[PDB]
Each structure stands twice: as C-alpha cells, then as structure tokens.
C-alpha cells in the first residue's frame, strides 16, 4: 500500500508475494446433509468456518436442534486448549415470505416446460402434489390479486419465466417464455408486484422464539423491505433475545431503495444475491452490492456477501475463474463476511469450498489499498468525545506506523473491538473476552479474532488485565501472528466493565 | 464521477439510474458449432458481438467457412454505413497443447491467418519477448498490421510480463490455463496487475475465460459470473470475452446480451474523477502533438459532458490515444480503412464507423463530410441529438480539437 | 510540480534552478513626482510596469491629465515595433470617503510631537484648518461628532498615532493620546469603530470618474467599497460611455470583508492592505488577503495585492527580507497583480522597486505547485455548455502535457484569454488583439501577455486568423518565450466576433 | 482543515473567527541595550518571549554574563509558582567568519562612482574614511578578482574591485550612503577561507558551556564538518547543548542535507543569506529548509527582519505582518526578533505582534493535508514511542482534545509528537530544567517544570505529574473540567520509552 495512486497500486500486485497468516474475512457456512456430521463439522472448523448458518426455509425444529447440537459438539471438541480454541457462531436464517410450487405428479421425475407453451397456475389444493406441464400449483393464496396480464412470473432460481395472459379469481393462464425442466417445491419470484405476504409470519415467529430458546447468536432475516420489518423481528426476539444480532437480508428492489432506514434499525446487512438477482436485473446486482458494502463500511456495521460465490464447487472440486474473482472482489469491496450456501449444505466438496474461500480471502486482504481506505474511513467518520472511539483510531494509526503483528483488545460486549475493526487495520484484532456470546458475535466484523478467556477474575484489576493481555500474546505466538521480536498494540480500560476502553499501548512481544 | 472519495462514490451507486446507451467495452465471442451459422451470427452482431474469435486449438477448411459466415453476416448490414457495425476476426493459436515457442502447426495457422486477412492473433502460452518475436517474424511483412495479443497463461509469462507487453500490441489475461498453472486464488492478482500495466501503457487488454461459464447450460448466469464481468470492466479491461458460452453452449445470444448489459452498467459506475487523474499523473510529458491534443480533448469532454469525441483517423492511432485516457463519452472513430475500423474494437470506448464516400478533392470539404458522417451516426444510434455539444479531432498528425454543436 | 505531495514540493525548491523568461504576474505602479517624467516612465516600462495607477486622493484634473499624457507618450515611444510593443494600462484610483487632518502650525517645527497620556483637542473650527499643533487638531470630516462615541479610538497617520475620545462636544472632541509620536500635515484618519456616514461616491468622486471616462482610462480602483450598491453607484456614474471600463473594488474595511461575496458585482478586487490593517487588527490581514485571493481565483476574477509590499525601498536601494517574502507569497497565494505605491510615486528607487517585483514574481511563479492548483481549480469550477470554457481547460491541460512554450489566444474582448488564465497554466498566454483597450485591460489577469496587432483586416477569416497567429509566433521568438521546433497551443474561433472561440491546435513553432 | 481542497480552505478563512489560547510557535528575542534590564525582560516573558538570544558578534563575556544573569532573574521572578511558570531558554549566537570594517576616523558619507581603497595595513585600521577603508579579512586579495562586488553594512553599500594589490584593492562605489564604524562585509561568489570555528569562537563556545546555555546558533555553517567542529569544542561537558546551524551562504544551501543530518536544528538566517544569494531567491531557500526540517522532525527557525520597521515604529508594515504569518504557515518551529528587540524603541510591541500573528496563523494551517503528508513521508518504525506519538496525534484530531500531555525526561518523546504537528498544545511535563527550556525549539511544546519530589511508587509519581499538567492547562485556559485530553506516559517503570496513550476527562 506504498503506491501513490490506485493504478500504481494495481500494477505492483505480485502473485509471488505471500500473504500473512491471519485471515480477516469471516466465513459463514450453511449446514446441511453434506456437513451436518460432527466429524465433518470438526473439519469445517479446521478449514476456517466461523459461523454456522441454519436455513429455516426447510427442516423441522427437531432437525435444526440436532444440527445445533452437532455444531456445538464439534466446537467444544477443541475447548480443552483455550489458546487454539476458535469460537463458532450459530445463525438462524428465517424462511420469511417465500413462494413455492407444489410437488410434480408421481407419474412424471420432472416435466419439460417448452418455450411458448401454455401453463395454468391454480390455487386449488387438489393439485398441490399433482404438478405437471399443464398445471402448476403454488402456495401464495393471493397471487391473483397482485399480478396482472403481461406480468412476469419466475420459477426455480429465476431460470423459468412465465407471462400472465389471463387472470382469474382462482387461476392464471401463462405463456412459457424461457422454458426448462421443472421440479418440485421450487421458489417463485414476482418482481414488480406488491406481494402482501407478512414480513414475519407465524412460522417465522415460532422459528424466532425457537432461536432464542436454543441461544443462537444472530438472525438472518429474509426479505426485509422496510425498517418496521426489522422492528417486528426485534419485538419477537424481545427482552430475552435482546442480545441476538439482527442481520437484515436485502433481497428485493424495495429493500435496496429503503436501505438506509433498514441499516439504521439492523445490527448488520446481508447482500442476499440469489433472490436479489431475480427481483432486480442480474446486471444491476454488483451495483447494489458495492453500494451496500460501502454504506455499511461507512456506518461501521457488519455486511455479508452471500450466495453462489463458489456455486460450481457444489459438483466440482475447484471453482471457476469467475467464482475466484467474485470472492476476491467481495473482500476488496469491503465485506465483513463471505458466505457459502449450497456449496456446504448439499455439495460434494464442502471442505474444499471452505478452504478455497480461506485462501482467496487472505490473498484479497493483502491486496487492499489501505492507504486510501484508512484515509477515507477517517475522513467520513465524525468527531466525538468518545474515549473508546479516539483510542480505536489511535491504535489503528499506530498499527500502520509500526506494522504491528496484531491489535489486542480486551472487551466484554465486543464493542471496543468493533470500533477498531471499523477502521480496517491490516493487522488482525485479537479480542479477549470472557463472554462466550461476545466471542461468537465477534465474527461478524472484519479482522476480529475472538479468543475466549476462562481464567477466573483476578481481584486486582491490574493483574486481571495483564492476565488477559498475556493470554492474547500466547494465542498470537501459537497461531503464528507474531514472534518475541515483534511489536503489537494493546487496548485496555481503566476499570472493569463495558464502556471504559481508553488506553492504547505499543508493546514489544515478550 | 463526482464524490470526493471512492468510498462515498460506492455509497452513491444507484440501481435505478439507467446508463448512457453506448457500450464502451468490446465483446469477443468464440465462434463454434453453436454460433458458426450465418443466421445466428447476424443475431450475435445485433446483440453486440464485435470480435469473432476462432480457436485454432481445433481444419483450415472449417475455419475458412466460419470466417466466410462471419463476413457474410457482417456485410449483411453493409447496405447502410450509418448503422453498419464493423466486426473483427481473431485467430487464436493452439501453442504447446498436450516445447516449441511457436509450433510448426502454429506457423501453418498463422500463415493461414495472413492469407485470410485476420485482424488480430491471440498467441497462446507466450512466455517471453522472443516468443512474440517468433510469432511476428512468422506473420512477416504481409501480416505487418495484424495486431498481436500475447495470452498470459503461465507463471513465467506473468514473471516476464513487462518484456511481453513491450513486445506485444496487447495482452489477454487467459485465466483458464493461468488458473491451473498458478494457484486459483492468485489469479485476481495477475488479472488486476496486468490490466493496470496495460492501462498504464495504453495497450489493449482482454479479460478472458469462464466469465459466464454457467450459461453454457443455463439461460441466466450465477451471481459470481455477473460480478466477474462487472469487475473486469471496473479493472479497466478493454474487452471481455466469451469462449464455450458462445462456441458450443445452449444460449449463445443470451451470453452476448448479458455481457453487453453488465459492461454498460459497470461503465456508468467507473470512478472517472480518480481514474482520469491517475492516468494523467502516470503518463509522461510529450512532444507529440497528437498526444497533447488527445488528453486535451478528453479533459474538454469532461468539462462539457460531451455526447461524444469524434476522431477522424486512418491508422486508428489518433483514436487509440484518446481511448487510453478513458473519457466517459463514446469515441466515434471515422475511417476509410476497413481494417482500422475492425481493429478499433480492441480499445475501450471506440465505436468505429467506416466511411465509404469518395475522397473530396478539397481537404476541407473531405474533413467536413467525414465529420458529418459521425454526426449522423450519433444521431441515429442515440449517442447524442441535435444541439448537443461534441468534440471533434482532425488534422501528419491529428492536432486540432473543436467544440461544436450537433446539427 | 512533479512531487506527489506539497511538503515534498517545498523540499525540492532549488535556488540554482533558473526560471522561465516570461513573468506572469502584472505590476501596477503608482505614478507620482518620482516617476511621472516621460524618460522615467520609459524605463519603468522597460523595467516591467504594466499598469500606471493614478491616485486621485491628491492632485488636480490638470495634473492627472498631464501624467496620463506622459504615460501614453512613453508607451507609444515603443509602438513602431508591434512585435515588442508592450501595452500599458491606465488606472484611476478614487479618493473615496477619506478623512485627513489639516496643516501644522507655521511657527512650530514641521512636525509636532504628541506624548503618551497628553490631551489633544480635535476641532472642526476652520480657523484652525492650517494651524494644527500638539494641542488642537483640525480635520475635514464635518460630521465626525455625530458618529464618534466617547471611549472610541481615533487613528492618525497610517494608524501610527492612536487617540482615545474622552468628551464629546459641539464642533470638537477631547481625546487623550494613547500611542504618541510625531504628527505632520494632512495625515489620514481612521475610525475603525464608527458608522462613518461619508458618501460611498462623493461629488468629487463623480467628477473624477467622469473625467476618467473623458480621459479613456482602462479601469477604476474604487476606494472603500462596502457593499454591492456602492459598486453599482460607481457603475452608474461611468454610464454607457464608460460601460467597458473595468471596476476593481478596493476592500479596506470590516464591512467590505464581511460583504465580500456580494461585492465581488465587480470586475475584480484589490486587497488594499494599507487602510485594511488599520480598520481591522493587523495580525488578521493575511487571513483577509488569502481569503479574497482564493475566492477571486475560484470566481475567475482579477485580484490585486497592494500596499507596503516593498515599503523600505522608498528610501533604500534593496528591500527587507520581509518584503521579498511578501511579494513571493502574494504570487503563491494566487494574486493576479502586485502593486507599488510610495515605492514608485515618491521614493528614491522607483526603478529598482519595479525590477525587484519583477525578479521575485518570476521566481515565485516557477515555485507554484501547479499539480495541485490545476486539479483543484478544475474540481471547483462548474460543468458548462460553454464551448469556449471547455476549449480553455482543454488548452491548459494540453499545455501541461507538452510543456508548451505558450498558449496563443486570438481574442477581441479579452474573455477567451481570461478564461484560459483562470486555470493558471504555467506557460505564458499570448493574447493577440486588434482592440487597444482589450490589450491594456489584459494585464489584470495572471499570465496574459497582450499584443496589439496593427495589420489590416484580411478579406477572408482563415487568412486573417493565420496572420494573427504568425504575429504571435514572431512575438514569442523575439521575446525569448519559445523557439522554432518548440510546440505551442493556439486558440482560435470559427467565426469573427466575440464568443466563438472553440478551436484548439497543438502546433510546432516554425 | 475541514475543506476538501486547499483552495476552498483559503476561501473559508474568516477574520471574525477567534483563535485558541495556546500559541504553538516559539519566539526568540535578541537581548540588547533596549531589553537588558530585569524590569523589561520580565515584561518580555509576559509578552511571550521563550528564548533569549545573545549575539556574540558584539559584546564581552562580562557584558553577556550580566545579560544572562538578568535573564535568569526575570525568569525566576515567576518561579515561586510552577503552574504559571514559563521556562525561558538562553541561546548563544556565535560570531563566525565575520568580515568587519574598522573604526572610522562617527559616520562618513560616500557617493556613487567615487573611488575607495580598501587596505589590510593595520595602520589605517582606526583611520577609516571616504578614501581608505580597513577590514580584517587578511586573505581578501586572494579570494576576490578584478570585477568582484563587495557589500558593506547589511548589503546596503556596494563596491566593485577595479585594481588588485598585495595589501590593497582599488574599488568603485556602486551604491553609496552613510558608511560607519565596524560595519559588516559580504563577498558573494568569493570563496572565503576564514575558519568556521574561530579562536574567539572556541572561547565564546567554552564560555557558553560554563554559563549553562541551552543552545548554540552557529554562524555561517557551510558543511557537515563545521557542525562537527562546533560539537567537538562543546565536548562532553556540553554534549547536551543543541547546535543549530545557521544557513546564510550559497554553500550552506547547496550542502544543506549533510548539515541537517549533523545538526540539532537549523536557523534560516535571512540577513546574510539575502546578500550572499540574490534577494529574490531567499524565499525559495526558506521554504526548502523549513520543509526538509519538517520532513526530518528537526527544529527550524525563521529569522532576521521579520518586523524590521518596528525598530522605529509602534506598528509593523503589511509586508512584515504577512512575513510572520507565512513563516508559520511554511512550518517554522520558531520565529525570531533581532534589532526589533535588541536596540529598537518598541521591543515589547514587537514581541506582542509576533505572538498575535503566530496565533492567528496556526489557526489557519490546513492540518488535513499537513498531517496526511507528514505521515506519508515518515518511515515505518519499530520504535514504540514513535508509533505511540503519531497515534496520539491521530487521536488528538479525532476527539479535538484540549491538549496532549507528555511526560518526558530528555524531551525526546515530546519532540516526536511535535513532528506530526497536532493542532492541540503539547504540555510536556519534565523535572529536567534543561529539557524544559530546550523544548521551545519545537512547535507546539508548552513545557512545564515539575518541582515536587519524586514519589516512590511509580504510578503515584506518574499521576502527580499528570495532574500537574491538568492544573496548568485549566489555569492557562487551554481546557476546562470535563474536556477530553490525551496523556502519554510510560507503561512499565524504567522501560525507557513513552508507549502509553490514555483518553481521559479533565478532573
Ligand atoms: O436468501 C438468500 O441468501 C439469497 O437469496 O441469496
Ligand atoms: O487458453 C486460454 O485461452 C486459457 O487458458 O484461458
Ligand atoms: O488605498 C489603498 O491602496 C490602501 O488603503 O492600501
Ligand atoms: O546572522 C543572522 O542572523 C543573519 O545573517 O540573518
Ligand atoms: K431463507
Ligand atoms: K442453502
Ligand atoms: K487611496
Ligand atoms: K552573528
Ligand atoms: Mg433469498
Ligand atoms: Mg486606502
Ligand atoms: Mg549573520
């Protein structure tokens, strides 16, 4: 990042200059049958998984309870050594207002819709398991009240398109535009219709209540379109779930247009590109992506790039060039986390997909033009009387000045570490906490390596601080972030409890 | 653009702001069984193909007929020079495919390329300067004006890159073998490095391979594919390429249309305020009047938000010089040399137009007729409309810039 | 300007690097008894004078008519060679609302000495108008009793003597000497904290401005402008006959600085530091200077830095270090012209003062950080449909790209040359005009070398353009600006008359 | 510094926007007949003097010893009270290789075109007149030639060498005027061979060590060894004495970098400099040196004729007010008064004016660009103190703190903060008296001498000094209770470096 121009910075990128050990971008993995086993989850963790996502679009509460137990069992298998122990977060991703088709008729396995053929859509439950090439059932009872003749209707990842020609009280007559093979229970998208399904349905409420009961760390709330949607999710989690982070998934045109009010009410954002690239033209997704990462970076709030990042690894052991590009560019954009969906839930190469993201994220982070980034984050940040905030930016500046091996942060809520991550140091942030939930939610922020201290509280505040600082030193040495010869930054408070971070030291590693 | 910072530039990206109708990034399509027919080539031109790529990695009689179908489809529109879109022809070698810098079979394809009047050659597995020299020595004096584009597909070619760029007319980032030759996670570094240096030197760079891979079988690309095309344009790739997507896949027209749509949206999103500043800062003081005029016109086009920069040019050089400075505005290059007009597609933002009118005896009348030709092109293609402001560059050098209304 | 930061640009300044032949900053010389002879004026033109300033605070119309005649006689003594002819402007500087004391007592020493704490009576009684002394002081502001308040401070003689008002009275005020010193005759009086009710444009000023129109002056330096309406009264007086006379508003009090934006209504600005640093605290003047120069640069309007720039050269043949610095820094600030007053009107070394301002201006111009200045003037200037503006910025960019020997501009009103100067090329701007007044007014703009083409109008437009272009080419070679085989930028229009500059050429010097 | 461009920053300058209280730029006053008495020296400290300059071109050790004693008397008159106590440094300005004429016949007028013989025969040494001038440069005839120009009395009088002899040269008056006694002589272009460190210099320099001076201003430094010579004479007894090389000739400018590398600081000595090189080039030399000294983190002083007209007048010229402002905008750590305070009629007015202008200028600095460029030009470090300092200045802007409080023994740590040019004042708490006086060489360092005894428990002693700074800042109107300030201390006792930054409210 020594070059005086971004262009010169590009020219100096060198594929033979190896990156640093520490990978800063968090990796979110969707758990499914391919990755649900305790054995596999241990290897997922080893490979670099930081957050387990449980897609409540499918599966019972008993099923997800079991996955959650396997995740925690895999995770606590490493707990015997707190110096190498890596916290793993659990994320609930709601179903939300999904539209799906019914089952293909048992006669059949899948029907071919061919270009220009007619297809009837009905809401008569007699066909809900008898779908075929002439009659398609779906589960949105009021689909007729929201579409008109000429409307487009999209089916199965937007790969099949239908145009309404007749619009009836019970039925719709459609003309197959782009045809293909149609299976069972495929997603339906109605872009540019005013879909009246609730943001938080009754299933979502029970799912969210269940989330609080199983002590999940965060919620990925589907199809958020306005701030009041976020507030309903918040109300459901209630007082008991007040510490669970709400990550609004931006997946439709309205979500993008009202992004600022959604951002202000949310704890973070996911750029949910799968649905988003069907609700809005596929050529516009990258615009929406870079806008949202930029604004979250500017707000200091976590943002997740999601969906089809390594899609071909569902079936192949190495990704496409486009897919390698896309993961790098999400990190360069400024994403706090990258995510995997089918690639880990259902694919033939779950571990290969995690490892590839780990490799690309680390190459991309060394390619960041920190000179310009740190300069602009500072220019867009407000002036304030916050001791923690002035301490965090001081520490980041100092970390650049001595190319520190890490920035060590004692934090109870995680906030002090979040305030450091918002200014994007090159150096990893080792966040020492005794709060296990804090160590799991730390993964939402770029660069925070959360380590969980289980030593007793020391009576003398000074001795307690030194204990946790020394703990971070050993973690740093053990994982190879620095050695005894190096300099590190250390952020500590003047008294116990949240809100008291006001001290930055520059210390040689002992 | 405007915002004082790149970060605020990003925050202001607006999905509902439609882009200017002119698409600056060239689209290179590999022709194969899915695309070799005259009827679909006509539709590939209409959907936005600018360069037909012919992969000699697989008989000369087969390629001669594909080449004939391309020219047939191309001149199918020649009835009208105001709407005629030139299409170039590219020969891609096999190289060492399972070693000789240039093969014996490559020497036969290259010589076959000259006889077929190909506009450019994509040279596979270029590893050093001497490798290009062997290709240009084989192209000889007949293919003197064939543009040579070294494909960087190997570690050494990356390692010896500066050599190769100097010895070449352009570069292709050939990621499919590059991604097996070097670790896949390092390819974005090589891609962005090479595009940066090509942008710095004013030499064309193609970003190639797997950009819309999943459209070989599907009618819509993945989210990562859409991102890859956009980011290649934001890197500065003069052209983006399709290989299997148009050569053999089930949706060749769909692949072309999508690269057109994405490239256009990405061009709208380029942070011109910074890019123009850095290209200028990084480019040397010159005594060449055409170079001084070129950056003067680009600066003028930003100041007045010109509908276009019209460049009268014969060898294309004058127009290339404008394009390296990356105006937002389309560069309408007017030329009588058909090969110049075909080859222009290798430079971002050059919309070539071929004048078929006879020379007027008076140089002034001749200049004005060609300029009026560009005016009609831009009115018809919707680049600008009557009463808009445009930039006109005319002449042994294009040294004169005029700021004129659109009549 | 090749360094990537301003700090590194300073570090690279080099006293052994000689500067380009052409000096861009105009030099305005106040004409008085030291300088009003035809022979001395000739040497002042050879020494670098571009504008003759006539201070109508003193002298009769007959006196000033003679000066003006002598200026034109010396200027036209060079007219036989149009290649070398330097146009020379004439400026009328108004008296404005001046307050002066009377004449000292004849019997006492030419100067009476006032001592700290003494009493001094100020009177309007005309029997004392030529009998001022250390006890009683006449002055010519008949209304000063109405607008001065007890406790307010009165300043006399370039703000060197200060008085504190003690008692008000009928046709008098009783004051106590705060800062003493020697007091002479007809010294200027400042009342910084009064609502001085003298007319913005007095009857004397109206007579003087009509006489300026009669004498064909090029510009008016309007004294003590406080508001836009003041400028409009000056412009009404000049009327239709003087409609082409440039009005330069002198900013010399607090209200003028306060209402600067509305005043800048004007064609240009003078920073009149003499009265300014008495009307406001002297430590604050450089703030006012840098503010006004910056806003005039951003507006594209001429700004003059004036007064005491080389004051010690009134009596000494070389200046103080502070004076060398002030001139250089006025040019680095962005000032279009620098000015001399007593140094050329009444001092012992008028010629040496002109040559020093020439020497310093030239060195400072090579020290401007053009890389930053061009970038910022562009960024702050509006987008435009104007073909001439787009052509001008394009010429300045091209002139930087080929390090051109000059930008040749054909112009009738001046404005095409003005529009180029606004973006501050390093290269000189040779403005070829047939309009003598345009040639004289061009000196108000940084970097414009005006040349007056005497050749008859050629029948065809293209022929006529090529003549004037070749005239500019011969001017540049004869004056040492460029030589054959160098490259220059040439700006010409598509049609005779003002407003049609569109055309920019990069052409070798034949 | 909130404007996106320097141009917009200029346009937003506002004369009705009052400055902050603390003045960051140091003021160096030449003490002489006008300013020697204990009474006015006191009023000079109250008016803003920080460094007392003693010019050993003139005067005897005894005279200067009495000057030094009157400086220490006024300064300690305030010592009763360490909260308000302002330390005052003492600087010794060497004579150097000065060429001076003899005693006339007491002035003598001289006219252009006339002849003037200059002799080295020490007989006419006290019989100088319109026909024969005597000067003390014994090799002058070796180092000038027929056609050379010679300047006398601050470059006002000029002569041209028409005939050369053994002990003489025959010259024609180029610019005349009232010649006088013992005036100064310059030979621009003449390769003068006089020694950099003279015999009298060694005596004067040894005299400075015994008088406990804080810094030497070494005249006419031409090369690195010259600084090495001044340093060797100061020896181990005076190893803690800062050597400021005075740049006042063409070779000093050409050889500036190696002189900077060898010195503790630089003075831009514009008087001789603007005679040795063309006056229109002085501003380039001044901006070059202040920039390179800013880059390197070493103090730089802008001196000579900043307020020259105030020697006789109570108000300065517009050019002088602008010169002081622009020196501060250039980057200078201190500005200087010479004749204005040593012999003139208004030395308290001059000190006060330099205080007033410097304050308004520091308020006008475009910190946004300045801080960004100082970092980009400063190298990556492994020193904890250095990274802590830049981190503290970054924190400074982030919370716009009242001050950066630095505990420091040698001063170093406060110097490392200062080089990054924070807007907030740096209150450097020290128990070392020499450290507290020398700190004035560095822009922004408001030094305070803690006199309370050491406390046994280190963290008790640290807090003692910290709360001293708090009272200091609250009393001098820098901040008020509740304001945020930055505090730089050590971490572990005896660590030797200042690697701890805390963001605390003022108690
Ligand atoms: O729900 C999602 O994550 C999506 O659509 O990408
Ligand atoms: O050969 C190629 O084009 C490649 O590997 O990308
Ligand atoms: O009138 C003036 O020129 C002044 O006050 O400086
Ligand atoms: O010695 C000095 O101070 C000078 O020459 O300016
Ligand atoms: K879901
Ligand atoms: K999934
Ligand atoms: K006046
Ligand atoms: K001296
Ligand atoms: Mg979705
Ligand atoms: Mg005035
Ligand atoms: Mg000296």
CATH number at residue C440: 3.40.1380.20
Instruction: Out of A23, A25, A30, A53, pick the active-site residue.
Output: A53
For chain C, report the end-to-end CA distance as a whole number of angstroms: 29
Please say whether the beta carbons of C488 and C507 come within 8 A.
yes
Q: Provide the CA B104 distance to its chain's centre, in angstroms.
A: 29
Sign of the Cα torsion D389, D390, D394, D397 reads: positive
Annotated binding site of B for Mg(2+): 153, 177
Inspect the interface and report whether the beta carbons of A397 and D400 lie closer than 8 Å.
no
Residue B136 in domain: yes
Closest in D376, D381, D394 to A394, CB measured? D394
On whether both C263 and C343 belong to a single domain, the answer is yes
Distance CA C387, CA C385 (A): 6
Burial class (CB in 10 A: 0-12, 13-18, 19+), D178: exposed
For residue A326, the tally of other CB atoms under 10 A from its CB is 31
On whether both A88 and A209 belong to a single domain, the answer is yes
On whether both B288 and B261 belong to a single domain, the answer is no
**Alpha helix (H) residue ranges in D297-346:** 318-330, 339-342
Among the candidates C140, C169, C190, a domain finishes at C190
Residue A55 marked in a binding site: yes
How near does any CA of chain A get to the CA of D227, in Å?
A: 32
Relative to the alpha carbon of A345, which ligand is closest? 6
Closest in D372, D381, D499 to A505, CB measured? D499
Inspect the interface and report whether the beta carbons of A318 and B183 lie closer than 8 Å.
no
Distance CA A404, CA C76 (A): 73
Nearest to B326 by CA among B271, B245, B385: B271
For residue D105, the tally of other CB atoms under 10 A from its CB is 11
**Rg of chain D in Å (alpha carbons):** 24
Catalytic (active site) residue D115: no
**What pairs with residue D90 in β-bridges?**
D52
Closest in B223, B232, B266 to A277, CB measured? B223
- Geometric angle at alpha carbon B225, from B221 and B226, rounded to 5°: 80
Nearest to B221 by CA among A285, A330, A333, A272: A285
Query: Which tokens is C461 given?
Result: 């437009």
Q: Residue D106 maps to which CATH number? A: 2.40.33.10
What size, in residues, is chain C? 510
On whether both B199 and B315 belong to a single domain, the answer is no
Catalytic (active site) residue A424: no
Nearest to D131 by CA among D115, D120, D119, D146: D115
What range defines the domain where residue D130 resides?
99-186
> By alpha-carbon position, which residue is closest to atom 6 of ligand 3?
C274
Query: Residues 6 or more apart from C329 whose CB is under 8 A from it?
Result: C364, D283, D322, D323, D326
Please say whether the beta carbons of D239 and D274 come within 8 A.
no
Closest in D7, D15, D319 to C297, CB measured? D7
Distance CA A406, CA A393 (A): 14
Relative to the alpha carbon of A93, which ligand is closest? 5
Residue A448 in domain: yes
* Crossing angle (nearest 10°) for helices D61-76 and D199-211: 30
Distance CA A367, CA A357 (A): 15
On whether both C238 and C348 belong to a single domain, the answer is yes
Nearest to B319 by CA among B54, B121, B86, B81: B86
Nearest to C318 by CA among D279, D323, D273: D279
Among the candidates C190, C220, C235, a domain finishes at C190
Distance CA A248, CA A265 (A): 9
Inspect the interface and report whether the beta carbons of B286 and C404 lie closer than 8 Å.
no
Distance CA A88, CA A217 (A): 10
**Alpha helix (H) residue ranges in B48-81:** 60-75
Distance CA A273, CA D452 (A): 67
Among the candidates B236, B267, B298, a domain finishes at B267
A273 lines ligand 1 (CB under 6 A): yes
For residue A423, the tally of other CB atoms under 10 A from its CB is 22
- Which chains sit next to A, with 3 or more Cβ pairs under 8 A? B, D
On whether both D92 and D117 belong to a single domain, the answer is no
User: Minimal Cα distance from A379: which residue of B?
Assistant: B5
Sign of the Cα torsion C210, C211, C216, C217 reads: negative
| Mutant choice from D503, D504, D505, D507 vs A, greatest count of A C-beta within 10 A | D503
D98 lines ligand 4 (CB under 6 A): no
In Å, what resolution does this model reach? Answer: 2.2
Residue C11 in domain: no
- Name the one residue in this structure whose structure tokens are 């640009």: C9
Catalytic (active site) residue A249: yes
On whether both B66 and B213 belong to a single domain, the answer is yes
Query: Residues 6 or more apart from C504 whose CB is under 8 A from it?
Result: B293, B296, B300, B400, B401, B402, C391, C394, C395, C398, C489, C490, C491
With contacts defined as CB-CB under 8 Å, which chain B residues touch C509? none
**Rg of chain B in Å (alpha carbons):** 20
Inspect the interface and report whether the beta carbons of B297 and C394 lie closer than 8 Å.
yes
Q: Provide the CA B357 distance to its chain's centre, in angstroms.
A: 26
Residue C377 in domain: yes
Residue D288 in domain: yes
How near does any CA of chain A get to the CA of D370, in Å?
A: 13
- Geometric angle at alpha carbon A418, from A414 and A423, rounded to 5°: 160
Nearest to D251 by CA among D301, D190, D299: D190
| Mutant choice from C4, C376, C390 vs B, greatest count of B C-beta within 10 A | C390
Residue C157 in domain: yes
On whether both C68 and C49 belong to a single domain, the answer is yes
Inspect the interface and report whether the beta carbons of D503 and A403 lie closer than 8 Å.
no
On whether both A419 and A463 belong to a single domain, the answer is yes
For residue B58, CA distances in Å to B64, B113, D162 come to 13, 14, 92
Residue D4 in domain: no
On whether both D230 and D355 belong to a single domain, the answer is yes
Sign of the Cα torsion B332, B338, B342, B347 reads: negative
Query: Which tokens is A123 given?
Result: 């809401």
With contacts defined as CB-CB under 8 Å, which chain A residues touch D401? 390
Q: Residue C273 maps to which CATH number? A: 3.20.20.60
- Geometric angle at alpha carbon D48, from D84 and D317, rounded to 5°: 160
Mutate which of C273, C282, C304 to test ligand 3's pocket (most atoms within 8 Å of Cβ)?
A: C273
For chain A, report the end-to-end CA distance as a whole number of angstroms: 28
Residue A16 in domain: no
- Geometric angle at alpha carbon D249, from D243 and D253, rounded to 5°: 75
For residue A203, CA distances in Å to A56, A199, A210, A255, C287 come to 10, 11, 10, 22, 67
Instruction: Out of A36, A95, A100, A152, pick the active-site residue.
Output: A100
Number of domains comprising chain D: 3
> By alpha-carbon position, which residue is closest to atom 2 of ligand 3?
C272
On whether both A265 and A394 belong to a single domain, the answer is no
For residue D163, the tally of other CB atoms under 10 A from its CB is 12
* H or E stretch covering C214: helix C203-215
- The full 3-state SS of A434-474, as one line of letters, equals CCHHHHHHHHHCCCEEEEECCCCCCCCHHHHHHHHHHHHHH
Nearest to D390 by CA among D374, D366, D406: D374
Elucidated via: X-ray
D94 lines ligand 4 (CB under 6 A): no
> By alpha-carbon position, which residue is closest to atom 1 of ligand 1?
A272
On whether both D355 and D430 belong to a single domain, the answer is no
């Amino acid at each position: 990042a020594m070059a005086d121009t971004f262009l010169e910075h590009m020219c100096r990128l060198d594929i033979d200059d190896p990156p640093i050990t520490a990978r800063n971008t968090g990796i979110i993995c969707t758990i499914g049958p391919a990755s649900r086993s305790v054995e596999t989850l241990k290897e997922m963790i080893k490979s670099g998984m930081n957050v387990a996502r449980l897609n409540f679009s499918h599966g019972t509460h008993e099923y997800h309870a079991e996955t959650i137990k396997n995740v925690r069992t895999a995770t606590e298998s490493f707990a015997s050594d707190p110096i190498l122990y890596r916290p793993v977060a659990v994320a609930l991703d709601t179903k939300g207002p999904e539209i799906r088709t019914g089952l293909i008729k048992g006669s059949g396995a899948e029907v071919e819709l061919k270009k220009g053929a007619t297809l009837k859509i009905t809401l008569d439950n007699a066909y809900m398991e008898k779908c075929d090439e002439n009659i398609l059932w779906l589960d949105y009872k009021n689909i007729c009240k929201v579409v008109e003749v000429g409307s487009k209707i999209y089916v199965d990842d937007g790969l099949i398109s239908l145009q309404v020609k007749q619009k009836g009280a019970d039925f719709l007559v459609t003309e197959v535009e782009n045809g293909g093979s149609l299976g069972s229970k495929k997603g339906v998208n109605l872009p540019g219709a005013a879909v009246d399904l609730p943001a938080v349905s009754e299933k979502d409420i029970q799912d969210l209540k269940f989330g609080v009961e199983q002590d999940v760390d965060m919620v990925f709330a589907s199809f958020i379109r306005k701030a009041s949607d976020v507030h309903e999710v918040r109300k459901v989690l209630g007082e008991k779930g007040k510490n669970i982070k709400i990550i609004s998934k931006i997946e439709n045109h309205e979500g993008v247009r009202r992004f600022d009010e959604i951002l202000e009410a949310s704890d973070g954002i996911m750029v949910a590109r799968g649905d988003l690239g069907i609700e809005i033209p596929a050529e516009k997704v990258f615009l929406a992506q870079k806008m949202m990462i930029g604004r979250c970076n500017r707000a200091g709030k976590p943002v997740i790039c999601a969906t089809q990042m390594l899609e071909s690894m569902i079936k192949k052991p190495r990704p496409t060039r486009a897919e390698g590009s896309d993961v790098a560019n999400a990190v360069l954009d400024g994403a706090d986390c990258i995510m995997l969906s089918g690639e880990t839930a259902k694919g033939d190469y779950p571990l290969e997909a995690v490892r590839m993201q780990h490799l690309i994220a680390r190459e991309a982070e060394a390619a960041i033009y920190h000179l310009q980034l740190f300069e602009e984050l500072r220019r867009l940040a407000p002036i304030t009387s916050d001791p923690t905030e002035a301490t965090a930016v001081g520490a980041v500046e100092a970390s650049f000045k001595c190319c520190s091996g890490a920035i060590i942060v004692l934090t109870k809520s995680g906030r002090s570490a979040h305030q450091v991550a918002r200014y994007r140091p090159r150096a990893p942030i080792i966040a020492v906490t005794r709060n296990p939930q804090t160590a799991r939610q730390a993964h939402l922020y770029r660069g925070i390596f959360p380590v969980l201290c289980k030593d007793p509280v020391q009576e003398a505040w000074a001795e307690d601080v030194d204990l946790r600082v020394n703990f971070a030193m050993n973690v740093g040495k053990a994982r190879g972030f620095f050695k005894k010869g190096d300099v590190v930054i250390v952020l500590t408070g003047w008294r116990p409890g949240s809100g008291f971070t006001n001290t930055m030291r520059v210390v040689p590693v002992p």
